[model samples]
Target: EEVTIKANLIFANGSTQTAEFKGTKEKALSEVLAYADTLKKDNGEWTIDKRVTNGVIILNIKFAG
Candidate 1:
């Protein structure tokens, strides 16, 4: 399976980082989620946007205060 994960991290300091991933949607989601977990204690303060295009899933991860 092929999946595309797009990660956009927004820190409390207002800095940002963008990244890309390619793998299974589930695998991609888990990896992205783990990275997000490292940046936060819980997912309550994060923004997760998922979109599907041509059967490919795109995950957009963001940080929120």
Candidate 2:
């Protein structure tokens, strides 16, 4: 089945991002988590981890520091 999920992807650089995924929610969530896990510290001035469901999401995050 095609899953449609919205997520605001954030980078390790005081910047906001947005992307659309057409796949399983579990897959989407896993992809997001994996990305987060791969990201290392000392790479961003500011960042955020957002798990979008249906509405607005405000995320405040930083490097694994």
Candidate 3:
């Protein structure tokens, strides 16, 4: 059996996002950091690019259509 592992983020839209990182490193935090910047930063509410220090991963996904 071969175990496969990659890096990705469970967005607020109940989606399993994946990334094709062309590097020699794999880190959950690093992946999020890179992708988070691509999110559209709102005005004054909250944003997907929030600095996830430590907490529940999902439990707070405000999904949209």
Candidate 4:
């Protein structure tokens, strides 16, 4: 079965962006991690602050120095 994964990107400037992935649970998480890597490459630094699974996977990413 396919599932939805959401990533909330919280920036240092207090702005936010969201990315969504849909696939098998593992695949969706892998995709979100890859997306986070891209953000780090484009921005500077970022960290996965929290993860909440409530029917869907939620990744809370925050900017870091």
Stretch of 10 with least lDDT, candidate 2: 56-65
Best by lDDT: 4
Ranking by lDDT: 4, 1, 2, 3
What C-alpha lDDT, on a 0 to 100 scale, does residue 5 get in candidate 1?
68
- Deviation of model 3 at 29, angstroms: 8.2
TM-score pick, better of 1 and 3: 1
Query: Candidate 4, 26: how far from true, in Å?
Result: 1.1
> All candidates' TM-scores?
0.66, 0.44, 0.33, 0.78
Better of 2 and 4 by lDDT: 4
Q: Tens digit of lDDT per residue, candidate 1, span 1-65?
A: 77776677766667778788888766878888877887776333777877876765656666665
The TM-score of predicted model 1 comes to 0.66
Q: Candidate 3: list runs displaced more than 4 Å.
A: 1-5, 24-32, 40-65
In order, candidate lDDTs are 0.72, 0.52, 0.37, 0.78
Question: Model 4, 22: alpha-carbon shift in Å?
Answer: 1.0
Model 4, poorest ten-residue lDDT window? 42-51
Write out the backbone clash pairs for model 4.
Answer: none
**What is the C-alpha lDDT profile of model 2 across 1-65, one tens digit per residue?**
34665555454455656555565656765665566555544443435555545643333345524
Model 2 has an lDDT value of 0.52
Residue 54's C-alpha lDDT in candidate 4?
79
The better candidate by lDDT, 1 or 3, is 1
